[PDB]
Amino acid sequence: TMDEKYVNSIWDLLKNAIQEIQRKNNSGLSFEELYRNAYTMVLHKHGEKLYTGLREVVTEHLINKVREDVLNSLNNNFLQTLNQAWNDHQTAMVMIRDILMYMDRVYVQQNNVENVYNLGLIIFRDQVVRYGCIRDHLRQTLLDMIARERKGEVVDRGAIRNACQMLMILGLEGRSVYEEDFEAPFLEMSAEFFQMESQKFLAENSASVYIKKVEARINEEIERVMHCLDKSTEEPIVKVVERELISKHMKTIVEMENSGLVHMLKNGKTEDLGCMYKLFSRVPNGLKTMCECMSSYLREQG
Amino acid sequence: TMDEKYVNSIWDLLKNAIQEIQRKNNSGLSFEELYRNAYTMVLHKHGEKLYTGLREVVTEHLINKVREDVLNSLNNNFLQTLNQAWNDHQTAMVMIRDILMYMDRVYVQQNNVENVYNLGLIIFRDQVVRYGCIRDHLRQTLLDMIARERKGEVVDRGAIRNACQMLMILGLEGRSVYEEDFEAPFLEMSAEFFQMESQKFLAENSASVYIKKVEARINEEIERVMHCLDKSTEEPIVKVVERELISKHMKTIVEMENSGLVHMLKNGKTEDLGCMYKLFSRVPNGLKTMCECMSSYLREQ
Amino acid sequence: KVPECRLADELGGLWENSRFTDCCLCVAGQEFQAHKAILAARSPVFSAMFEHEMEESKKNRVEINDVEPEVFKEMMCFIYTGKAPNLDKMADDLLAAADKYALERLKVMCEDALCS
Amino acid sequence: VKVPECRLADELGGLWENSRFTDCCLCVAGQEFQAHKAILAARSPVFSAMFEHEMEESKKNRVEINDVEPEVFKEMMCFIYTGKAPNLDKMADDLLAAADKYALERLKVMCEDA
């Protein structure tokens, strides 16, 4: 095995260089030299050794250094630290994929494996962002900010936005990671909050005010998506507002004894009736519900 | 005219830029601006005023400033003074050509005038290099130091090389100026020199020493041409020294008493007999004569 | 089978995307980024502008006030790709611009347009 | 009226063949060649990356290549600048290797025709 040793030899140079880049020591390196070595492995049918080597050198760094760095920052500038590790790794992987460019062109697709950058993304995703303790802390930090901003507090909206975008990219041009790690609990947590909110609003004891309070709630949640969250979450958060605050309480809003639609429809409140039509038209059977309470009333007169 | 008052404004700025380039103060100026301005006035058909003004400006400089530098250097560092003028002139012209480039493109061939650079060469050659006093002194300095090198001295070959190549360039892609100014007087004086030489060398009454001396001179006239003088001068100079050292005196060489081909034959001199073949085989009747004299000795025996 | 040459389109990308640029052209106050070597290989007027020791070589900057930026932009497209897709609209000015900067083929492409 | 044929490949050729306004140096087999970063980068993603990063070549404006015969390099450069490979047919095997290494697709196909 002497061709073994030659290829081991070339891998050895690369691995060393890769590690320097990981420690941001790249200035001393030669792009020509590194690219040429990487090219020579693939050219000689050893793309697998190169590919599986790249996997270990990147996995080793993320486990040992990047993750420890993040775990050192729970409850201590956690988001800034995660985002900083995210940017460093993006910069590193951009240098690395380029040195291994020949591989992305000649080996990767032909062998049904992820290109270099995406293999990079997959490891960051699985080793840092989805490490047990980090994943928990990311999720509750984000949710806790949203829940406090709801209550009046002022929170870093940029930080949330950076965290979401990251989750997006980690899903490989799809929303699977953002959805599972952030969106699914966001809605679930949001639903709990709205249902509680509906109980407050119903103490205020006016239909038109409940209806207005809901109109403003939908708008707050849309402006929060546009500014903090992935835009693909707009419709989903709007459906939960509508379910929790309209579909689950619509008969109760419509048949209210003094402020109910019948009360409006006799006390000549055209605007309020209008505000009520706009809101109920959003959900299944919302108008059918209004038309029913109206119909009984119209029927009763004679 | 308002339109002809503007046109005169553009030239003033341009005439000022050219003098400022003439003084070596290039850095401040703006190429775009100067180029745009010269373009504009040609564009409006003022090409003629541009060209005439250019001729006036370049001429006034080479005559009032350039010619006087050279003339106030006649006895000291004359060659270098002339050469820096020439180097400075080339440098200015390259930047004056380019700002006036549009004129070279759309004005000068269409009006049967010389382009800008060639105009500069023509003015420099006529007003500096061909100006009587300088023309004569240049020629004398070049020939005299060549004469001195021949008498054994060391001279600055460097300056002779620079001066010859200027003459060449001033011929406009031709060699007329170098040929009339330098080469012709050079061939005239080399002839008179190798004439006196050979008569002085024959006053040695020794054929082999005459032969070695001549070869030495010939190798050297060739080395001077190939490293200092223009390379086209090779043929004329070889032709001049071979006629004066060998052709005119072949019969005299092969027939001279106690040193002649017969003296070498009887003696058996061989090293001497070879050096004579190599020299006479240069000339038109050179070997043919050696064979005639040698015949006459073989005749006896 | 052999693909069509791609020189034009690839060079076009340098101007489009401003990659590795080395000089600034301020046209009526609008700064444009470009490449000395390319302007020089294509226009002997640009070439002389960068070669000498004049304000444009020193500051890596040209102040161009006689060309309209849309028109300047079409001239630059021509310089880098040899094509001028928007020529028909400004054929008048472009021809004046081409002639100033000695872009010879461009000056003729324009002339064809003015004959209709 | 007659429009002259396109002259972009020939004018650009002039920068390569006369070393006019060069910004980088390539040392091949101990022979220095001058080039233009933008032109190499535009025509090769390999050269483009090479000059995009804060690596030695970017820092020194100089590239050390010991893997390509200089006459083959000179022809690769010729295609990079002009899109033409006049001496391709006497070097087709080696010009191929080089073009595949520097991601010059059309050249790789041109070479493959032997």
CATH number at residue A13: 1.20.1310.10
Domain shared by B163 and B206, yes or no: yes
Task: Give this entry's resolution in angstroms.
Answer: 2.4
Domain shared by A186 and A291, yes or no: no
Relative to beta strand D31-35, strand D24-28 is antiparallel
The whole-angstrom separation of Cα A57 and Cα C110 is 59
Beta bridge partners of C33: C24
- Phi and psi, residue D34, nearest 5°: -105, 145
With CB atoms and an 8 Å threshold, state whether D101 touches A102.
yes
CA-based torsion, A100, A102, A104, A106: positive or negative: negative
The whole-angstrom separation of Cα B235 and Cα B239 is 6
- Phi and psi, residue B217, nearest 5°: -65, -45
Domain shared by B9 and B120, yes or no: yes
Which residues neighbour B278 within 8 Å (Cβ) at sequence distance 6 or greater?
B215
The whole-angstrom separation of Cα A275 and Cα A207 is 10
Using a CB–CB cutoff of 8 Å, tell me whether B193 touches chain C. no
The whole-angstrom separation of Cα B151 and Cα A217 is 112
The whole-angstrom separation of Cα A212 and Cα A191 is 19
Domain count, chain B: 3
Using a CB–CB cutoff of 8 Å, tell me whether D23 touches chain C. yes
The whole-angstrom separation of Cα B128 and Cα B166 is 12
The whole-angstrom separation of Cα C79 and Cα C73 is 10
Helices B132-150 + B157-169 axis angle, to 10: 140
Per DSSP, C28 falls in state: T
**Which among C8, C47, C109 has CB closest to D8?**
C8
With CB atoms and an 8 Å threshold, state whether D38 touches C41.
no
The whole-angstrom separation of Cα C92 and Cα C110 is 7
Rounded to the nearest angstrom, the gap between the alpha carbon of residue B280 and the centroid of all alpha carbons in its chain is 30
| Cα→Cα distances D101→A32, A273, D22, D95, D98, Å | 11, 73, 23, 10, 5
Domain shared by B121 and B59, yes or no: yes
Find out whether A194 and A241 touch, Cβ atoms under 8 Å: yes
Nearest to residue B276, comparing CAs of B211, B225, B229? B211
The domain of A1 spans 1-127
Residue in D with minimal Cα distance to C21 = D38
| Number of CB pairs, chain C paired with chain D, less than 8 A apart | 84
Nearest to residue C79, comparing CAs of C104, C45, C112, C42? C42
First to last CA, chain C: 38
B and A adjacent (3 or more CB pairs under 8 angstroms): no
**Other CB atoms within 10 A of residue B79 CB:** 19
In the Cβ-directed half-sphere of A297, how many Cα atoms lie within 13 Å? 15
Domain shared by A102 and A170, yes or no: no
Instruction: Write out the two tokens for A285.
Output: 């059977």
First to last CA, chain D: 41
Q: After which residues is chain D broken (C to N over 2.5 A)?
A: none
Residues 27-46 of chain C whose Cβ lies under 8 A from any Cβ of chain D: 35-38, 40-42
Rounded to a whole number of angstroms, the distance from the CA of C28 to the nearest CA of chain D is 26
- Phi and psi, residue D27, nearest 5°: -100, 110
The whole-angstrom separation of Cα A191 and Cα D11 is 68
Calculate Rg over the CA atoms of chain C.
14
Let me know if B265 is exposed, middle or buried by CB neighbors in 10 A (0-12, 13-18, 19+).
middle
Find out whether C82 and C104 touch, Cβ atoms under 8 Å: no
Domain shared by B247 and B258, yes or no: no
Residue in C with minimal Cα distance to D9 = C7
Instruction: Write out the two tokens for D94.
Output: 């080696």
Rounded to a whole number of angstroms, the distance from the CA of A47 to the nearest CA of chain D is 15
Strand runs labelled E in C35-116: 61-64
Nearest to residue D86, comparing CAs of D68, D110, D66? D110
Find out whether C106 and C84 touch, Cβ atoms under 8 Å: yes
Domain shared by A1 and A123, yes or no: yes
Using a CB–CB cutoff of 8 Å, tell me whether C10 touches chain D. yes
Question: Which amino acid is located at D56 in the chain?
Answer: E
C-contacting chains (≥3 CB pairs under 8 Å): B, D
With CB atoms and an 8 Å threshold, state whether C54 touches B30.
yes
SS3 labels along A82-110: HHHHHHHHHHHHHHHHHHCHHHHHHCCHH
Q: Is D63 helix (H, G, I), strand (E, B) or coil?
A: strand
Domain shared by A76 and A163, yes or no: no
Calculate Rg over the CA atoms of chain B.
28
Rounded to a whole number of angstroms, the distance from the CA of D64 to the nearest CA of chain A is 7
Nearest to residue D12, comparing CAs of B182, B215, C8, C74? C8
Contacts made by residues B132-135, CB under 8 angstroms, sequence distance 24+:
B133/B71, B133/B74, B134/B67, B134/B70, B134/B71, B134/B82, B135/B181
**Other CB atoms within 10 A of residue B46 CB:** 19
Question: Which amino acid is located at C47 in the chain?
Answer: S
Relative to beta strand C61-64, strand C23-27 is parallel
Q: Is C31 helix (H, G, I), strand (E, B) or coil?
A: strand
Secondary-structure breakdown of chain C: helix, strand, coil percentages, each rounded to the nearest 5 = 60, 10, 30
DSSP letters for A156-194: -HHHHHHHHHHHHHTTSSSSHHHIIIIIHHHHHHHHHHH
The CA-based dihedral angle spanning residues B210, B211, B217, B220, taken in that order and rounded to the nearest 10 degrees: -150
The whole-angstrom separation of Cα C25 and Cα C34 is 7
Instruction: Write out the two tokens for B244.
Output: 């004066």
Rounded to the nearest angstrom, the gap between the alpha carbon of residue A196 and the centroid of all alpha carbons in its chain is 25
Let me know if A212 is exposed, middle or buried by CB neighbors in 10 A (0-12, 13-18, 19+).
middle
Which residues neighbour D81 within 8 Å (Cβ) at sequence distance 6 or greater?
D9, D12, D13, D15, D16, D39
Choose one of B103, B127, B151: the last residue of a domain: B127
Tokens 């030695």 sit on residue? D56
CATH of the domain at B284: 6.10.280.240
Choose one of B101, B127, B153: the last residue of a domain: B127
Domains defined along chain C, listed by start: 1-116 (3.30.710.10)
Domain shared by B2 and B123, yes or no: yes
Domain shared by A171 and A247, yes or no: yes
Residues 46-75 of chain C whose Cβ lies under 8 A from any Cβ of chain B: 48-49, 52-58, 62-64, 66
Q: Is D26 helix (H, G, I), strand (E, B) or coil?
A: strand
SS3 labels along chain B: CHHHHHHHHHHHHHHHHHHHHHCCCCCCCCHHHHHHHHHHHHHCCCHHHHHHHHHHHHHHHHHHHHHHHHHCCCCCCHHHHHHHHHHHHHHHHHHHHHHCHHHHHHCCCCCCCCCHHHHHHHHHHHHHHCCHHHHHHHHHHHHHHHHHHHCCCCCCHHHHHHHHHHHHHCCCCCCHHHHHHHHHHHHHHHHHHHHHHHHHHHCCCCHHHHHHHHHHHHHHHHHHHHHCCCHHHHHHHHHHHHHHHCHHHHHHHHHCCCCCHHHHHHHCCCHHHHHHHHHHCCCCCHHHHHHHHHHHHHHHC
Rounded to the nearest angstrom, the gap between the alpha carbon of residue A41 and the centroid of all alpha carbons in its chain is 38
Find out whether D42 and C14 touch, Cβ atoms under 8 Å: yes
In the Cβ-directed half-sphere of D21, how many Cα atoms lie within 13 Å? 28
Find out whether C60 and C24 touch, Cβ atoms under 8 Å: yes
The whole-angstrom separation of Cα A101 and Cα A113 is 14
| Cα→Cα distances C2→C5, D44, D112, Å | 9, 18, 10
Nearest to residue A18, comparing CAs of A63, A48, A50? A50
Domain shared by B105 and B1, yes or no: yes
Q: To probe the interface with C, which of B31, B37, B40, B107 has the most C CB atoms within 10 Å?
A: B31
* Cβ-based contacts of A102 with chain D (< 8 Å): 101, 103
Nearest to residue B163, comparing CAs of B182, B144, B147, B145? B182
With CB atoms and an 8 Å threshold, state whether A101 touches D65.
no
Identify how many contiguous H helices and E strands chain A contains and give both numbers: 17, 0
Q: Is C83 helix (H, G, I), strand (E, B) or coil?
A: coil
Beta bridge partners of A19: none
Q: Is D6 helix (H, G, I), strand (E, B) or coil?
A: coil
Nearest to residue D1, comparing CAs of C84, C115, C87, C88? C115
Using a CB–CB cutoff of 8 Å, tell me whether C26 touches chain B. no
Relative to beta strand C30-34, strand D62-65 is unpaired
Choose one of A71, A93, A127: the last residue of a domain: A127
The kind and range of the H/E element at D33 are: strand D31-35
Using a CB–CB cutoff of 8 Å, tell me whether C104 touches chain B. no
Question: Which amino acid is located at A60 in the chain?
Answer: E
Using a CB–CB cutoff of 8 Å, tell me whether D92 touches chain C. no
Domain shared by B133 and B121, yes or no: no
